[PDB]
Chain A
Amino acid sequence: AENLWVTVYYGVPVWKEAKTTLFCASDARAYEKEVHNVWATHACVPTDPSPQELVLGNVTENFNMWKNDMVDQMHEDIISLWDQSLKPCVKLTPLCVTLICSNATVKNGTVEEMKNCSFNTTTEIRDKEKKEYALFYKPDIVPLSETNNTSEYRLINCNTSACTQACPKVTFEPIPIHYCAPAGYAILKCNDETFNGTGPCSNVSTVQCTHGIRPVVSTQLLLNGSLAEKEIVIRSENLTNNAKIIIVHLHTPVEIVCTRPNNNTRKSVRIGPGQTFYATGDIIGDIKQAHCNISEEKWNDTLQKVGIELQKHFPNKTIKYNQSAGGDMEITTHSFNCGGEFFYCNTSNLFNGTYNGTYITITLQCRIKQIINMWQGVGRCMYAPPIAGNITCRSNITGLLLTRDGGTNSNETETFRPAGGDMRDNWRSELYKYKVVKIEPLGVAPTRCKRRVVGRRRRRR
């Protein structure tokens, strides 16, 4: 014990848990692209070459990837950006007309999926109309009931909600986005890659801004993600819980090549006074239907590694991967955007096979859709115009999304199904490292110093 006096002392670093909306910063020159994009703002211009870093000395702090509010913030950010960038574009409403449709004859053959549909449309003067034809490259057009005529189809937007097309002036792009804290907050970061979702981390580092995050969307598979450096990681709310989810990160990527062999032709249609409508006019080449290719020699080994990783948590239980679960078309099929188009794939052989984890070219047939909801699944309908010529995608698979079966199978067997989920999960797989804490320069701490005495100046005391 010793004689002491209060000492206002401050300017100190001490932090606490908090929540607050963040500031966005896009990487490199991409802001000049960001002038016109969706999934990128207008515009997250970077004021500094982020991220600068230090390793904090002997600091350990709690983390949590599930309670993390940054994913919750960026979900609202992306959905608002999507809606507002789509808002001023041309609406599609007057096309909902009785479509007469037939087999889509093409050069030296007949195409497999689509239907050649012709309909009445409004010319420039509203008092007259003309016959026009377009090739909707999806069989998804509902045949109108109440009629024995088996050809009077309807566009399915008008069944439930009017829609809007994406202006070609703006483009879908997964531009990387860095989140930067506002003034007075620090974004802590954990560097221990063994972090399995929740618990202490003892190599905490601070940064001005988060690392490269790109908002790319996919279901049943992650595209262009970031890999755990050492081993394949498993993360979950609670594995023994039948519900919730299991997120997996691969140790090395596996190349996915996806392409659209049909040579489409972009066509214009004059629906209104300045409103121009884009549709696939005519196919000018051979037909093979869209498909994707994955090398089996890497991917089988990838399943075997993830299988032994699963068996670590599930002792002596053999792992079965089996068919996709069911339900809607957006999660029974691998969805992923590419080049303004949308691909849907059946997962032909991305599920099958039993692999004990002890060691005792794949083709995907893919459909294509023009009219989509946001993968949110209730929001605004969108029309994506066709892209001329072939489209080719090259991307790196990095993580899988799984859910568990149960709960009265024979105790020695267990089954996992590839099934997507809420869009927050895709970003949460990449945003597991960060927190947001407010710096609080605190109040009073004791010292052996003494009073100020009429405001008198003194030296050391």
Chain B
Amino acid sequence: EIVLTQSPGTLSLSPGETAIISCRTSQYGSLAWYQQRPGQAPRLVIYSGSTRAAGIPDRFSGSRWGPDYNLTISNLESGDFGVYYCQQYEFFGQGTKVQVD
């Protein structure tokens, strides 16, 4: 029964404005977010729900609702746009992309 689901698919947003990404789950377990620009090595963003990784401003964070997770971001400047992936224990969601207007 272990399946993930991420939504929405892709976005075009103006820089400096917020964005929202959702990641679902179907089992008791941790969660973490990975960001990926094209080509380069992807990066850790947040893990264990709402805790934040080293060397990142407080633009990126989210909440653990229990049966779902919501990731919201603020003041997304043009340099920080990219592709975002959700994690559990092995399962990687289909991901979401945000692109510069």
Contact = CB atoms under 8 A, between A and B. Distances in A.
Contact, chains A and B (beta carbon distance below 8 A): yes
A221 to B, nearest CB: 27
A242 B1 contact: no
9 contacts: A240-B27, A240-B28, A241-B29, A241-B89, A242-B89, A407-B89, A407-B90, A408-B90, A408-B91
Contacts of A240: 27-29, 89
A411 B91 CA distance: 14
B90 A411 contact: no
Interface of A: 240-242, 406-408, 411
Interface in B1-50: 1-2, 27-29
B90 A406 contact: yes
A411 B89 contact: no
A72 to B, nearest CB: 25
A240 to B, nearest CB: 6
B4 to A, nearest CB: 11
Contacts, number: 17
A240 B30 CA distance: 11
Contacts of B27: 240
Contacts of A408: 90-91
Which 8 residue pairs of A and B lie closest in terms of their CB atoms, listed nearest first?
A407-B90, A242-B90, A411-B1, A241-B89, A242-B89, A240-B29, A406-B90, A240-B27
Given A240-B28, A407-B2, A407-B91, 8 more contacts: A240-B27, A240-B89, A241-B29, A242-B90, A407-B90, A408-B90, A408-B91, A411-B1
A242 B29 CA distance: 11
Interface of B: 1-2, 27-29, 89-91
A407 B90 CA distance: 6
A242 B2 CA distance: 12
Contacts of A407: 2, 89-91
A407 B1 CA distance: 11
A241 B91 CA distance: 12
A411 B2 CA distance: 8
A411 B26 CA distance: 13
Nearest to B27: A240
B8 to A, nearest CB: 24
Contacts of B29: 240-241
A163 B2 CA distance: 50
A461 to B, nearest CB: 55
A242 B27 CA distance: 13
Nearest to A412: B1
B47 to A, nearest CB: 15
A52 B2 CA distance: 50
A406 B90 CA distance: 8
A408 B2 CA distance: 8
Nearest to B29: A240
B81 to A, nearest CB: 30
A242 B87 CA distance: 13
Contacts of A406: 90
Contacts of B91: 407-408
Nearest to A411: B1
Contacts of A242: 89-90
B91 to A, nearest CB: 7
Contacts of B89: 240-242, 407
A408 B91 CA distance: 8
B66 to A, nearest CB: 16
A6 B27 CA distance: 53
Contacts of B90: 242, 406-408
A315 to B, nearest CB: 10
A406 B88 CA distance: 13
